[PDB]
């Protein structure tokens, strides 16, 4: 019976709650806020 219940439900992987470790990961910007609006008028095409 253990494996029964371990070769039908294990391989599956569903239905089961699933837990793995991974890494923070964290972004940032620039104070910078290209959109089109009135005013301002931007051609949009910048390089970094």
Same mark, same amino acid.
């Given at each position: 019976? +253990?494996? %029964?219940?371990?070769?039908?439900?294990?391989?599956?992987?569903? %239905?089961?709650? +699933?837990?793995?470790?991974?890494?923070?990961?964290?972004?940032?910007?620039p104070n910078?806020?290209?959109?089109?609006?009135?005013?301002?008028?931007?051609?949009?095409?910048? /390089? /970094?």
């Open positions: 019976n +253990q494996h %029964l219940i371990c070769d039908n439900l294990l391989p599956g992987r569903d %239905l089961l709650l +699933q837990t793995r470790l991974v890494n923070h990961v964290s972004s940032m910007r910078i806020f290209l959109g089109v609006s009135e005013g301002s008028a931007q051609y949009k095409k910048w /390089y /970094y």
